[PDB]
Amino acid sequence: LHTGTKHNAIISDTTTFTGQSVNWVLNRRVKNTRYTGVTLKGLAATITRQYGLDLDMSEEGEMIENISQVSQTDWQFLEKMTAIQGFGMRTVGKVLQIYKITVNAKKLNYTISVVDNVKSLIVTDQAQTDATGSSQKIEHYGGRMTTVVD
Amino acid sequence: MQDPIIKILIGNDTFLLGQEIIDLDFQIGEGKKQNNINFTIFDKDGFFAD
């Protein structure tokens, strides 16, 4: 979907067009709403129906009993809901697909070789630390509120 | 050996390879990354820019 344009007008008469995926539509406006007694698939289905998108998600997901969307875009709320349940979203054409983040989820495999059609390969490794990164990164690591009060 | 064909349909007009297309970019992302496109065309007098 076209979202921006640029043009140099006098000598290099060149126009640059920029387009983004349909998830940019869900990231358009901030919302405040509440959901109760709905599974992940149902919530995603309602959100996609609000924009005319299609849904592709095999697993129903867990049942969310009470949560509020507070000053968040629909894409941001979907990101939070899928991340907290171990899911991830992807967009192709018009349809948004939600899948499980598992070590064996890539159904088809494609193998390349360095000796052929490869121009540059840079492999890097780093040590985990809570000093860098975001709060979500250290949440995904061992850091978490293990102790809570009902 | 590459024999590329690139056709872009925007609004109601098409840009073909060898006509006005100068450069083209891509992105096919998963979760953190999205899908985006950035392509540059030659716009004599900026007509399409208009």
Partner: peptide, 24 residues
Amino acid sequence: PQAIAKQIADIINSQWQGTLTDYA
């Protein structure tokens, strides 16, 4: 020198626009 300082600045700006529109 200043020509290239400006070029580099513009490169950085457009590189950042890349990133802005690279992330969901």
